[PDB]
Amino acid sequence: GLPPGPLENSSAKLVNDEAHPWKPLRPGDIRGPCPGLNTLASHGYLPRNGVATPAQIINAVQEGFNFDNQAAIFLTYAAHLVDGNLITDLLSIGRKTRLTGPDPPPPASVGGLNEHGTFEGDASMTRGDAFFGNNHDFNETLFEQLVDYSNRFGGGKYNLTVAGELRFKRIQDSIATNPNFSFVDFRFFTAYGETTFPANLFVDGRRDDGQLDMDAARSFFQFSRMPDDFFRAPSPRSGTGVEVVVQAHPMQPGRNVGKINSYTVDPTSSDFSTPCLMYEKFVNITVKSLYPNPTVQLRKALNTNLDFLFQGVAAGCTQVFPYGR
């Protein structure tokens, strides 16, 4: 189905309402590394089992949180291309599931958002690095570090100053302890934007002050649960203020090279100076690696989802076509 268009009405409104109550997980219900999608599934903005179409995810992030249309399109189709089933049009917001339908041939994993190295990656704020054995569950120690950073840099609240310090701390902990730490291309970009999302989207829209309290923070990050009477943001947004996060501790894209404390800059990586390159490498290297010589139906589905992806790409970039036209 087509990418949904922006909200007709983007006002702050109650999204924790009678039609979208929080429910606990049933057996089979999938939650993953994204507290946003997790919250939308747990309020029934997405199917509660955590398996959804791209169109469902786009409508959910807009309606539930006032995520802006362009960000919603780019992030949803990028995740779907690398983690979703392109024939069934279904994506797991967590673990690999037979509910996404019959798999394509390898090396495509259709591993859901839990799949490491595709969308999900290292130096997450409240989830551990995949090397430490779990890239998706809420982590109490990490969240207590977010609370500590909120006390030290945010006067008890999560804000872009806290994002700046914590983003860097998580990178330096991954450099120190994960010999397989990877911080290049797609992850380098998403890792910065994600640290703004709590300040931009988890703050009650009647305040919209970019100061997230630790009760609300815990309710989203741990329980996938809106605060009682939660109002979504009063206007569409996603990553606004990411510039403050980068400016706090500017980092070059790089990786550990099989050892802790071996962070090596990758000159082949995109950075914030080459945003078009990040899109080109994502489509030409990542997507094409998972589907090197696709069958005619898969090729059609790929081309359709790549067109959709390109709608989410900022103007100034040229569309790349790994399967032709």
Ligand X SMILES: CCCCCCCCCCCC(=O)O
Q: Is 114 in the site for Mg ion (CB under 5 A)?
A: no
Q: Which does 242 bind (CB under 5 to 8 A by kind): Cl ion, ligand X, ligand NAG, none?
A: ligand X
3-state secondary structure 173-210: HHHHHCCCCEECHHHHHHHHHHHHHHHHHCCCCCCCCC
Strand partners, 317: none
Among 41, 160, 216, 217, interactor with ligand NAG by CB under 6 A: 160
Q: Does 75 bind ligand X (CB under 6 A)?
A: yes
Q: How far is the CB of 268 from ligand X (least distance, A)?
A: 20
**Is-contact 130 122, C-beta < 8 A?**
yes
Choose the contact partner of 68 out of ligand NAG, ligand HEM, Cl ion, none; CB within 5 to 8 A by kind.
Cl ion
Q: Which of 17, 321 has the CB closer to ligand HEM?
A: 17
Span interacting with ligand NAG, options 49-57, 65-73, 102-110, 151-159, rule CB under 6 A: 151-159
239 touches Cl ion (CB under 5 A): no
Q: Report the alpha-carbon distance of residue 3 to residue 40 in Å, rounded.
A: 18
Partners of 183 in the β-ladder? 254
Q: At closest approach, how far in Å is the CB of 79 from ligand NAG?
A: 20
Report if residue 281 touches ligand NAG, rule: CB under 6 A: yes
Write the CB contacts of 276 (distance below 8 Å, at least 6 apart in sequence).
313, 316, 317, 318
34 known ligand binder: yes
Closest CA to 202 of 7, 27, 3, 40: 40
124 binds, among ligand X, ligand NAG, Mg ion, none (CB under 5 to 8 A by kind): Mg ion
**Which positions from 208 through 267 interact with Mg ion, judged by CB under 5 A?**
none
Among 47, 154, 294, 312, binds ligand NAG (CB under 6 A): 154
Which residues, in sequence order, are CB contacts of 76 under 8 Å at separation 6+?
Answer: 3, 54, 57, 58, 61, 312
CA distance 134 to 59: 29
Q: Distance between terminal CA atoms of the chain?
A: 19
The interface region with Cl ion, picked from 44-52, 234-242, 251-259, 293-301 by CB under 5 A, is 234-242
Which residues of this chain interact with ligand NAG, rule CB under 6 A? Answer: 9, 11, 13, 128, 139-142, 154-155, 159-161, 210, 280-281, 284, 320-322
Which residues of this chain interact with Mg ion, rule CB under 5 A? Answer: 120, 124, 127, 135
Annotated binding-site members? 34
